[PDB]
Amino acid sequence: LECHNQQSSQAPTTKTCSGETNCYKKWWSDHRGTIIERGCGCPKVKPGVNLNCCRTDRCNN
């Protein structure tokens, strides 16, 4: 699957994974502002950080 792996609001990017079927997209609002990360899988996090898995191409755009 061609998911996304670009942190912050920098120049987007695309890549393929060899194993995981679903991806995700996490983000939060720190003192610095708002940040967003991606990755192939569906982990969890401690209260305070948002995250959501998906099974669509560039779903974590």
CHARMM-style PDB file with segment names, atoms N, HN, CA, C and O in Angstrom:
ATOM      1  N   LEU     1       0.840  -1.227   0.000  1.00  0.00      PROA
ATOM      2  CA  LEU     1       0.000   0.000   0.000  1.00  0.00      PROA
ATOM      3  C   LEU     1       0.862   1.259   0.000  1.00  0.00      PROA
ATOM      4  O   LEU     1       1.906   1.306   0.651  1.00  0.00      PROA
ATOM      5  N   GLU     2       0.417   2.274  -0.733  1.00  0.00      PROA
ATOM      6  HN  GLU     2      -0.431   2.235  -1.261  1.00  0.00      PROA
ATOM      7  CA  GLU     2       1.148   3.533  -0.817  1.00  0.00      PROA
ATOM      8  C   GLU     2       0.632   4.531   0.217  1.00  0.00      PROA
ATOM      9  O   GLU     2      -0.206   5.379  -0.092  1.00  0.00      PROA
ATOM     10  N   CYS     3       1.137   4.424   1.440  1.00  0.00      PROA
ATOM     11  HN  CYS     3       1.818   3.735   1.691  1.00  0.00      PROA
ATOM     12  CA  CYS     3       0.730   5.311   2.517  1.00  0.00      PROA
ATOM     13  C   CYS     3       1.609   6.556   2.562  1.00  0.00      PROA
ATOM     14  O   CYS     3       2.489   6.735   1.720  1.00  0.00      PROA
ATOM     15  N   HSD     4       1.363   7.411   3.548  1.00  0.00      PROA
ATOM     16  HN  HSD     4       0.648   7.265   4.232  1.00  0.00      PROA
ATOM     17  CA  HSD     4       2.134   8.639   3.706  1.00  0.00      PROA
ATOM     18  C   HSD     4       3.094   8.528   4.887  1.00  0.00      PROA
ATOM     19  O   HSD     4       2.847   7.776   5.830  1.00  0.00      PROA
ATOM     20  N   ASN     5       4.186   9.283   4.827  1.00  0.00      PROA
ATOM     21  HN  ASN     5       4.386   9.894   4.061  1.00  0.00      PROA
ATOM     22  CA  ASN     5       5.183   9.274   5.891  1.00  0.00      PROA
ATOM     23  C   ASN     5       5.891  10.622   5.975  1.00  0.00      PROA
ATOM     24  O   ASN     5       7.120  10.688   6.013  1.00  0.00      PROA
ATOM     25  N   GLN     6       5.105  11.694   6.004  1.00  0.00      PROA
ATOM     26  HN  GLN     6       4.107  11.641   5.973  1.00  0.00      PROA
ATOM     27  CA  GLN     6       5.654  13.043   6.081  1.00  0.00      PROA
ATOM     28  C   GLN     6       5.213  13.741   7.363  1.00  0.00      PROA
ATOM     29  O   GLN     6       4.029  14.015   7.555  1.00  0.00      PROA
ATOM     30  N   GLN     7       6.174  14.026   8.235  1.00  0.00      PROA
ATOM     31  HN  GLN     7       7.137  13.804   8.078  1.00  0.00      PROA
ATOM     32  CA  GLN     7       5.888  14.694   9.495  1.00  0.00      PROA
ATOM     33  C   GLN     7       5.733  16.198   9.289  1.00  0.00      PROA
ATOM     34  O   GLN     7       6.303  16.766   8.357  1.00  0.00      PROA
ATOM     35  N   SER     8       4.962  16.836  10.162  1.00  0.00      PROA
ATOM     36  HN  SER     8       4.499  16.375  10.919  1.00  0.00      PROA
ATOM     37  CA  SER     8       4.735  18.273  10.072  1.00  0.00      PROA
ATOM     38  C   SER     8       4.058  18.633   8.752  1.00  0.00      PROA
ATOM     39  O   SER     8       3.520  17.765   8.065  1.00  0.00      PROA
ATOM     40  N   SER     9       4.088  19.917   8.404  1.00  0.00      PROA
ATOM     41  HN  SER     9       4.525  20.622   8.962  1.00  0.00      PROA
ATOM     42  CA  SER     9       3.476  20.389   7.167  1.00  0.00      PROA
ATOM     43  C   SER     9       4.514  20.524   6.058  1.00  0.00      PROA
ATOM     44  O   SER     9       4.379  21.367   5.171  1.00  0.00      PROA
ATOM     45  N   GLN    10       5.548  19.691   6.112  1.00  0.00      PROA
ATOM     46  HN  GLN    10       5.658  19.006   6.833  1.00  0.00      PROA
ATOM     47  CA  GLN    10       6.608  19.720   5.110  1.00  0.00      PROA
ATOM     48  C   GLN    10       6.130  19.119   3.792  1.00  0.00      PROA
ATOM     49  O   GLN    10       4.966  18.742   3.658  1.00  0.00      PROA
ATOM     50  N   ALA    11       7.037  19.033   2.825  1.00  0.00      PROA
ATOM     51  HN  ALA    11       7.983  19.339   2.935  1.00  0.00      PROA
ATOM     52  CA  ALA    11       6.711  18.477   1.518  1.00  0.00      PROA
ATOM     53  C   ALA    11       6.270  17.019   1.634  1.00  0.00      PROA
ATOM     54  O   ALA    11       7.087  16.153   1.948  1.00  0.00      PROA
ATOM     55  N   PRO    12       4.979  16.734   1.383  1.00  0.00      PROA
ATOM     56  CA  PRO    12       4.434  15.373   1.462  1.00  0.00      PROA
ATOM     57  C   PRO    12       5.332  14.336   0.794  1.00  0.00      PROA
ATOM     58  O   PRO    12       6.291  14.683   0.105  1.00  0.00      PROA
ATOM     59  N   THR    13       5.014  13.063   1.005  1.00  0.00      PROA
ATOM     60  HN  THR    13       4.235  12.780   1.565  1.00  0.00      PROA
ATOM     61  CA  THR    13       5.789  11.974   0.422  1.00  0.00      PROA
ATOM     62  C   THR    13       4.969  10.690   0.373  1.00  0.00      PROA
ATOM     63  O   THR    13       3.942  10.574   1.041  1.00  0.00      PROA
ATOM     64  N   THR    14       5.428   9.727  -0.422  1.00  0.00      PROA
ATOM     65  HN  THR    14       6.263   9.821  -0.964  1.00  0.00      PROA
ATOM     66  CA  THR    14       4.735   8.453  -0.557  1.00  0.00      PROA
ATOM     67  C   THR    14       5.720   7.288  -0.542  1.00  0.00      PROA
ATOM     68  O   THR    14       6.863   7.423  -0.977  1.00  0.00      PROA
ATOM     69  N   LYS    15       5.264   6.144  -0.039  1.00  0.00      PROA
ATOM     70  HN  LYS    15       4.335   6.034   0.314  1.00  0.00      PROA
ATOM     71  CA  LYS    15       6.101   4.952   0.032  1.00  0.00      PROA
ATOM     72  C   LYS    15       5.244   3.696   0.170  1.00  0.00      PROA
ATOM     73  O   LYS    15       4.066   3.775   0.517  1.00  0.00      PROA
ATOM     74  N   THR    16       5.843   2.542  -0.103  1.00  0.00      PROA
ATOM     75  HN  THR    16       6.800   2.478  -0.385  1.00  0.00      PROA
ATOM     76  CA  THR    16       5.133   1.272  -0.010  1.00  0.00      PROA
ATOM     77  C   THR    16       5.648   0.439   1.160  1.00  0.00      PROA
ATOM     78  O   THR    16       6.843   0.445   1.457  1.00  0.00      PROA
ATOM     79  N   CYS    17       4.741  -0.273   1.820  1.00  0.00      PROA
ATOM     80  HN  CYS    17       3.770  -0.277   1.579  1.00  0.00      PROA
ATOM     81  CA  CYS    17       5.103  -1.113   2.955  1.00  0.00      PROA
ATOM     82  C   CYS    17       5.041  -2.591   2.581  1.00  0.00      PROA
ATOM     83  O   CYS    17       4.237  -2.993   1.740  1.00  0.00      PROA
ATOM     84  N   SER    18       5.894  -3.392   3.210  1.00  0.00      PROA
ATOM     85  HN  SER    18       6.547  -3.066   3.893  1.00  0.00      PROA
ATOM     86  CA  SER    18       5.934  -4.826   2.942  1.00  0.00      PROA
ATOM     87  C   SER    18       5.550  -5.621   4.185  1.00  0.00      PROA
ATOM     88  O   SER    18       6.414  -6.143   4.890  1.00  0.00      PROA
ATOM     89  N   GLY    19       4.250  -5.707   4.447  1.00  0.00      PROA
ATOM     90  HN  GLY    19       3.548  -5.283   3.875  1.00  0.00      PROA
ATOM     91  CA  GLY    19       3.775  -6.440   5.606  1.00  0.00      PROA
ATOM     92  C   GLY    19       2.445  -5.918   6.113  1.00  0.00      PROA
ATOM     93  O   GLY    19       1.407  -6.550   5.919  1.00  0.00      PROA
ATOM     94  N   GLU    20       2.476  -4.759   6.765  1.00  0.00      PROA
ATOM     95  HN  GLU    20       3.319  -4.245   6.922  1.00  0.00      PROA
ATOM     96  CA  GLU    20       1.264  -4.151   7.302  1.00  0.00      PROA
ATOM     97  C   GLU    20       0.250  -3.889   6.193  1.00  0.00      PROA
ATOM     98  O   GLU    20       0.622  -3.566   5.064  1.00  0.00      PROA
ATOM     99  N   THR    21      -1.030  -4.031   6.523  1.00  0.00      PROA
ATOM    100  HN  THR    21      -1.332  -4.293   7.440  1.00  0.00      PROA
ATOM    101  CA  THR    21      -2.096  -3.809   5.555  1.00  0.00      PROA
ATOM    102  C   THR    21      -2.790  -2.475   5.804  1.00  0.00      PROA
ATOM    103  O   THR    21      -3.273  -1.833   4.871  1.00  0.00      PROA
ATOM    104  N   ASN    22      -2.836  -2.063   7.067  1.00  0.00      PROA
ATOM    105  HN  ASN    22      -2.444  -2.584   7.825  1.00  0.00      PROA
ATOM    106  CA  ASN    22      -3.470  -0.801   7.439  1.00  0.00      PROA
ATOM    107  C   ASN    22      -2.443   0.179   7.997  1.00  0.00      PROA
ATOM    108  O   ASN    22      -1.469  -0.223   8.634  1.00  0.00      PROA
ATOM    109  N   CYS    23      -2.671   1.464   7.753  1.00  0.00      PROA
ATOM    110  HN  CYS    23      -3.462   1.791   7.236  1.00  0.00      PROA
ATOM    111  CA  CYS    23      -1.780   2.508   8.221  1.00  0.00      PROA
ATOM    112  C   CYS    23      -2.470   3.347   9.291  1.00  0.00      PROA
ATOM    113  O   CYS    23      -3.517   2.955   9.808  1.00  0.00      PROA
ATOM    114  N   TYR    24      -1.893   4.496   9.624  1.00  0.00      PROA
ATOM    115  HN  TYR    24      -1.044   4.814   9.204  1.00  0.00      PROA
ATOM    116  CA  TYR    24      -2.485   5.362  10.636  1.00  0.00      PROA
ATOM    117  C   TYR    24      -2.013   6.800  10.486  1.00  0.00      PROA
ATOM    118  O   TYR    24      -1.221   7.125   9.602  1.00  0.00      PROA
ATOM    119  N   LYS    25      -2.518   7.651  11.368  1.00  0.00      PROA
ATOM    120  HN  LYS    25      -3.162   7.387  12.087  1.00  0.00      PROA
ATOM    121  CA  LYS    25      -2.162   9.064  11.379  1.00  0.00      PROA
ATOM    122  C   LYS    25      -2.417   9.649  12.759  1.00  0.00      PROA
ATOM    123  O   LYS    25      -3.555   9.680  13.229  1.00  0.00      PROA
ATOM    124  N   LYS    26      -1.357  10.112  13.404  1.00  0.00      PROA
ATOM    125  HN  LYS    26      -0.433  10.088  13.023  1.00  0.00      PROA
ATOM    126  CA  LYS    26      -1.473  10.686  14.738  1.00  0.00      PROA
ATOM    127  C   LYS    26      -1.126  12.165  14.735  1.00  0.00      PROA
ATOM    128  O   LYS    26      -0.365  12.634  13.889  1.00  0.00      PROA
ATOM    129  N   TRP    27      -1.690  12.895  15.689  1.00  0.00      PROA
ATOM    130  HN  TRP    27      -2.308  12.514  16.377  1.00  0.00      PROA
ATOM    131  CA  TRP    27      -1.422  14.321  15.811  1.00  0.00      PROA
ATOM    132  C   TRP    27      -1.759  14.824  17.202  1.00  0.00      PROA
ATOM    133  O   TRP    27      -2.432  14.146  17.978  1.00  0.00      PROA
ATOM    134  N   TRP    28      -1.282  16.020  17.505  1.00  0.00      PROA
ATOM    135  HN  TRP    28      -0.735  16.570  16.875  1.00  0.00      PROA
ATOM    136  CA  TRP    28      -1.524  16.631  18.803  1.00  0.00      PROA
ATOM    137  C   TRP    28      -1.317  18.139  18.741  1.00  0.00      PROA
ATOM    138  O   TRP    28      -0.949  18.684  17.700  1.00  0.00      PROA
ATOM    139  N   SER    29      -1.557  18.804  19.865  1.00  0.00      PROA
ATOM    140  HN  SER    29      -1.856  18.361  20.710  1.00  0.00      PROA
ATOM    141  CA  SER    29      -1.395  20.250  19.950  1.00  0.00      PROA
ATOM    142  C   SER    29      -0.517  20.628  21.140  1.00  0.00      PROA
ATOM    143  O   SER    29      -1.011  20.821  22.251  1.00  0.00      PROA
ATOM    144  N   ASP    30       0.784  20.732  20.898  1.00  0.00      PROA
ATOM    145  HN  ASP    30       1.186  20.575  19.996  1.00  0.00      PROA
ATOM    146  CA  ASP    30       1.731  21.085  21.951  1.00  0.00      PROA
ATOM    147  C   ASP    30       1.937  22.595  22.016  1.00  0.00      PROA
ATOM    148  O   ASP    30       1.346  23.345  21.238  1.00  0.00      PROA
ATOM    149  N   HSD    31       2.777  23.033  22.949  1.00  0.00      PROA
ATOM    150  HN  HSD    31       3.257  22.425  23.581  1.00  0.00      PROA
ATOM    151  CA  HSD    31       3.061  24.455  23.118  1.00  0.00      PROA
ATOM    152  C   HSD    31       3.613  25.059  21.830  1.00  0.00      PROA
ATOM    153  O   HSD    31       3.380  26.232  21.535  1.00  0.00      PROA
ATOM    154  N   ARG    32       4.344  24.252  21.069  1.00  0.00      PROA
ATOM    155  HN  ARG    32       4.533  23.299  21.309  1.00  0.00      PROA
ATOM    156  CA  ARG    32       4.929  24.706  19.814  1.00  0.00      PROA
ATOM    157  C   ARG    32       3.857  24.855  18.737  1.00  0.00      PROA
ATOM    158  O   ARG    32       3.983  25.684  17.835  1.00  0.00      PROA
ATOM    159  N   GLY    33       2.806  24.049  18.840  1.00  0.00      PROA
ATOM    160  HN  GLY    33       2.704  23.377  19.572  1.00  0.00      PROA
ATOM    161  CA  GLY    33       1.729  24.107  17.869  1.00  0.00      PROA
ATOM    162  C   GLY    33       1.069  22.758  17.660  1.00  0.00      PROA
ATOM    163  O   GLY    33       0.687  22.090  18.620  1.00  0.00      PROA
ATOM    164  N   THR    34       0.934  22.357  16.399  1.00  0.00      PROA
ATOM    165  HN  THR    34       1.244  22.900  15.619  1.00  0.00      PROA
ATOM    166  CA  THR    34       0.316  21.080  16.066  1.00  0.00      PROA
ATOM    167  C   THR    34       1.256  20.226  15.220  1.00  0.00      PROA
ATOM    168  O   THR    34       1.872  20.719  14.275  1.00  0.00      PROA
ATOM    169  N   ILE    35       1.361  18.947  15.565  1.00  0.00      PROA
ATOM    170  HN  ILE    35       0.860  18.547  16.332  1.00  0.00      PROA
ATOM    171  CA  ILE    35       2.227  18.027  14.834  1.00  0.00      PROA
ATOM    172  C   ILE    35       1.465  16.775  14.413  1.00  0.00      PROA
ATOM    173  O   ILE    35       0.497  16.382  15.064  1.00  0.00      PROA
ATOM    174  N   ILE    36       1.906  16.153  13.323  1.00  0.00      PROA
ATOM    175  HN  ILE    36       2.693  16.472  12.795  1.00  0.00      PROA
ATOM    176  CA  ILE    36       1.255  14.947  12.818  1.00  0.00      PROA
ATOM    177  C   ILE    36       2.273  13.939  12.282  1.00  0.00      PROA
ATOM    178  O   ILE    36       3.151  14.295  11.497  1.00  0.00      PROA
ATOM    179  N   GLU    37       2.152  12.681  12.709  1.00  0.00      PROA
ATOM    180  HN  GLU    37       1.438  12.392  13.348  1.00  0.00      PROA
ATOM    181  CA  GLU    37       3.056  11.631  12.255  1.00  0.00      PROA
ATOM    182  C   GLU    37       2.271  10.477  11.637  1.00  0.00      PROA
ATOM    183  O   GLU    37       1.060  10.369  11.827  1.00  0.00      PROA
ATOM    184  N   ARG    38       2.967   9.619  10.898  1.00  0.00      PROA
ATOM    185  HN  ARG    38       3.951   9.707  10.744  1.00  0.00      PROA
ATOM    186  CA  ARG    38       2.328   8.478  10.249  1.00  0.00      PROA
ATOM    187  C   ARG    38       3.132   7.199  10.461  1.00  0.00      PROA
ATOM    188  O   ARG    38       4.150   7.201  11.153  1.00  0.00      PROA
ATOM    189  N   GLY    39       2.663   6.109   9.859  1.00  0.00      PROA
ATOM    190  HN  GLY    39       1.835   6.108   9.297  1.00  0.00      PROA
ATOM    191  CA  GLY    39       3.342   4.834   9.987  1.00  0.00      PROA
ATOM    192  C   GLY    39       2.459   3.668   9.582  1.00  0.00      PROA
ATOM    193  O   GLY    39       1.233   3.780   9.587  1.00  0.00      PROA
ATOM    194  N   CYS    40       3.081   2.548   9.229  1.00  0.00      PROA
ATOM    195  HN  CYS    40       4.077   2.457   9.224  1.00  0.00      PROA
ATOM    196  CA  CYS    40       2.339   1.362   8.815  1.00  0.00      PROA
ATOM    197  C   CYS    40       2.003   0.480  10.016  1.00  0.00      PROA
ATOM    198  O   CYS    40       2.873  -0.188  10.573  1.00  0.00      PROA
ATOM    199  N   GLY    41       0.732   0.488  10.405  1.00  0.00      PROA
ATOM    200  HN  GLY    41       0.024   1.031   9.953  1.00  0.00      PROA
ATOM    201  CA  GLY    41       0.289  -0.307  11.534  1.00  0.00      PROA
ATOM    202  C   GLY    41      -0.942   0.280  12.197  1.00  0.00      PROA
ATOM    203  O   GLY    41      -1.705   1.009  11.564  1.00  0.00      PROA
ATOM    204  N   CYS    42      -1.139  -0.035  13.474  1.00  0.00      PROA
ATOM    205  HN  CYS    42      -0.519  -0.628  13.989  1.00  0.00      PROA
ATOM    206  CA  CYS    42      -2.286   0.477  14.215  1.00  0.00      PROA
ATOM    207  C   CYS    42      -2.049   0.394  15.723  1.00  0.00      PROA
ATOM    208  O   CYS    42      -2.768  -0.318  16.424  1.00  0.00      PROA
ATOM    209  N   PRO    43      -1.039   1.122  16.229  1.00  0.00      PROA
ATOM    210  CA  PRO    43      -0.709   1.132  17.655  1.00  0.00      PROA
ATOM    211  C   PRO    43      -1.629   2.044  18.458  1.00  0.00      PROA
ATOM    212  O   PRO    43      -2.654   2.503  17.954  1.00  0.00      PROA
ATOM    213  N   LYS    44      -1.256   2.303  19.708  1.00  0.00      PROA
ATOM    214  HN  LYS    44      -0.423   1.930  20.117  1.00  0.00      PROA
ATOM    215  CA  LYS    44      -2.048   3.162  20.582  1.00  0.00      PROA
ATOM    216  C   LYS    44      -1.170   4.223  21.237  1.00  0.00      PROA
ATOM    217  O   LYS    44       0.031   4.293  20.976  1.00  0.00      PROA
ATOM    218  N   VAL    45      -1.775   5.046  22.089  1.00  0.00      PROA
ATOM    219  HN  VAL    45      -2.751   4.989  22.301  1.00  0.00      PROA
ATOM    220  CA  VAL    45      -1.044   6.101  22.780  1.00  0.00      PROA
ATOM    221  C   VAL    45      -1.748   6.510  24.070  1.00  0.00      PROA
ATOM    222  O   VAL    45      -2.931   6.230  24.258  1.00  0.00      PROA
ATOM    223  N   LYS    46      -1.009   7.175  24.954  1.00  0.00      PROA
ATOM    224  HN  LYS    46      -0.047   7.402  24.801  1.00  0.00      PROA
ATOM    225  CA  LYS    46      -1.543   7.620  26.221  1.00  0.00      PROA
ATOM    226  C   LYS    46      -2.356   8.902  26.050  1.00  0.00      PROA
ATOM    227  O   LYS    46      -2.008   9.752  25.231  1.00  0.00      PROA
ATOM    228  N   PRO    47      -3.446   9.045  26.826  1.00  0.00      PROA
ATOM    229  CA  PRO    47      -4.322  10.207  26.767  1.00  0.00      PROA
ATOM    230  C   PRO    47      -3.561  11.511  26.549  1.00  0.00      PROA
ATOM    231  O   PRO    47      -2.642  11.838  27.300  1.00  0.00      PROA
ATOM    232  N   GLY    48      -3.952  12.250  25.516  1.00  0.00      PROA
ATOM    233  HN  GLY    48      -4.699  11.985  24.906  1.00  0.00      PROA
ATOM    234  CA  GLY    48      -3.297  13.509  25.210  1.00  0.00      PROA
ATOM    235  C   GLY    48      -2.923  13.617  23.745  1.00  0.00      PROA
ATOM    236  O   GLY    48      -2.889  14.712  23.183  1.00  0.00      PROA
ATOM    237  N   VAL    49      -2.643  12.476  23.127  1.00  0.00      PROA
ATOM    238  HN  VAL    49      -2.671  11.587  23.583  1.00  0.00      PROA
ATOM    239  CA  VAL    49      -2.270  12.437  21.718  1.00  0.00      PROA
ATOM    240  C   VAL    49      -3.342  11.730  20.895  1.00  0.00      PROA
ATOM    241  O   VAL    49      -3.835  10.672  21.285  1.00  0.00      PROA
ATOM    242  N   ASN    50      -3.697  12.318  19.757  1.00  0.00      PROA
ATOM    243  HN  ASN    50      -3.296  13.177  19.440  1.00  0.00      PROA
ATOM    244  CA  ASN    50      -4.715  11.738  18.885  1.00  0.00      PROA
ATOM    245  C   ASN    50      -4.086  10.813  17.848  1.00  0.00      PROA
ATOM    246  O   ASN    50      -2.950  11.021  17.421  1.00  0.00      PROA
ATOM    247  N   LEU    51      -4.838   9.793  17.450  1.00  0.00      PROA
ATOM    248  HN  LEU    51      -5.760   9.624  17.797  1.00  0.00      PROA
ATOM    249  CA  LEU    51      -4.369   8.829  16.466  1.00  0.00      PROA
ATOM    250  C   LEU    51      -5.547   8.087  15.840  1.00  0.00      PROA
ATOM    251  O   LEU    51      -6.570   7.876  16.493  1.00  0.00      PROA
ATOM    252  N   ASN    52      -5.404   7.694  14.577  1.00  0.00      PROA
ATOM    253  HN  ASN    52      -4.573   7.866  14.047  1.00  0.00      PROA
ATOM    254  CA  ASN    52      -6.470   6.976  13.887  1.00  0.00      PROA
ATOM    255  C   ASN    52      -5.929   6.116  12.742  1.00  0.00      PROA
ATOM    256  O   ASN    52      -5.237   6.612  11.853  1.00  0.00      PROA
ATOM    257  N   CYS    53      -6.252   4.825  12.779  1.00  0.00      PROA
ATOM    258  HN  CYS    53      -6.814   4.422  13.502  1.00  0.00      PROA
ATOM    259  CA  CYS    53      -5.815   3.887  11.756  1.00  0.00      PROA
ATOM    260  C   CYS    53      -6.768   3.906  10.564  1.00  0.00      PROA
ATOM    261  O   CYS    53      -7.916   4.337  10.682  1.00  0.00      PROA
ATOM    262  N   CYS    54      -6.285   3.436   9.422  1.00  0.00      PROA
ATOM    263  HN  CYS    54      -5.353   3.086   9.326  1.00  0.00      PROA
ATOM    264  CA  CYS    54      -7.090   3.397   8.206  1.00  0.00      PROA
ATOM    265  C   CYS    54      -6.523   2.416   7.209  1.00  0.00      PROA
ATOM    266  O   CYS    54      -5.336   2.089   7.229  1.00  0.00      PROA
ATOM    267  N   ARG    55      -7.397   1.956   6.337  1.00  0.00      PROA
ATOM    268  HN  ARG    55      -8.361   2.222   6.320  1.00  0.00      PROA
ATOM    269  CA  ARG    55      -7.041   0.983   5.338  1.00  0.00      PROA
ATOM    270  C   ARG    55      -7.258   1.527   3.927  1.00  0.00      PROA
ATOM    271  O   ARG    55      -7.748   0.817   3.050  1.00  0.00      PROA
ATOM    272  N   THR    56      -6.890   2.789   3.717  1.00  0.00      PROA
ATOM    273  HN  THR    56      -6.492   3.366   4.430  1.00  0.00      PROA
ATOM    274  CA  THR    56      -7.045   3.419   2.410  1.00  0.00      PROA
ATOM    275  C   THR    56      -5.739   4.066   1.960  1.00  0.00      PROA
ATOM    276  O   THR    56      -4.929   4.488   2.786  1.00  0.00      PROA
ATOM    277  N   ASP    57      -5.542   4.140   0.647  1.00  0.00      PROA
ATOM    278  HN  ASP    57      -6.200   3.797  -0.024  1.00  0.00      PROA
ATOM    279  CA  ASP    57      -4.335   4.738   0.088  1.00  0.00      PROA
ATOM    280  C   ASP    57      -4.250   6.217   0.448  1.00  0.00      PROA
ATOM    281  O   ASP    57      -5.184   6.979   0.201  1.00  0.00      PROA
ATOM    282  N   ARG    58      -3.123   6.615   1.032  1.00  0.00      PROA
ATOM    283  HN  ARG    58      -2.364   5.996   1.232  1.00  0.00      PROA
ATOM    284  CA  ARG    58      -2.920   8.004   1.429  1.00  0.00      PROA
ATOM    285  C   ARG    58      -3.990   8.445   2.424  1.00  0.00      PROA
ATOM    286  O   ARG    58      -4.327   9.626   2.504  1.00  0.00      PROA
ATOM    287  N   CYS    59      -4.517   7.486   3.179  1.00  0.00      PROA
ATOM    288  HN  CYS    59      -4.243   6.527   3.114  1.00  0.00      PROA
ATOM    289  CA  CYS    59      -5.546   7.765   4.167  1.00  0.00      PROA
ATOM    290  C   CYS    59      -5.017   8.674   5.274  1.00  0.00      PROA
ATOM    291  O   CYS    59      -5.776   9.426   5.887  1.00  0.00      PROA
ATOM    292  N   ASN    60      -3.714   8.599   5.524  1.00  0.00      PROA
ATOM    293  HN  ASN    60      -3.098   7.988   5.027  1.00  0.00      PROA
ATOM    294  CA  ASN    60      -3.084   9.411   6.558  1.00  0.00      PROA
ATOM    295  C   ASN    60      -2.442  10.658   5.959  1.00  0.00      PROA
ATOM    296  O   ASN    60      -1.448  11.166   6.479  1.00  0.00      PROA
ATOM    297  N   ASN    61      -3.017  11.148   4.864  1.00  0.00      PROA
ATOM    298  HN  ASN    61      -3.825  10.736   4.442  1.00  0.00      PROA
ATOM    299  CA  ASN    61      -2.503  12.332   4.195  1.00  0.00      PROA
ATOM    300  C   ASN    61      -2.713  13.576   5.050  1.00  0.00      PROA
ATOM    301  OT1 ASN    61      -2.339  14.676   4.643  1.00  0.00      PROA
TER     302      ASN     61
END
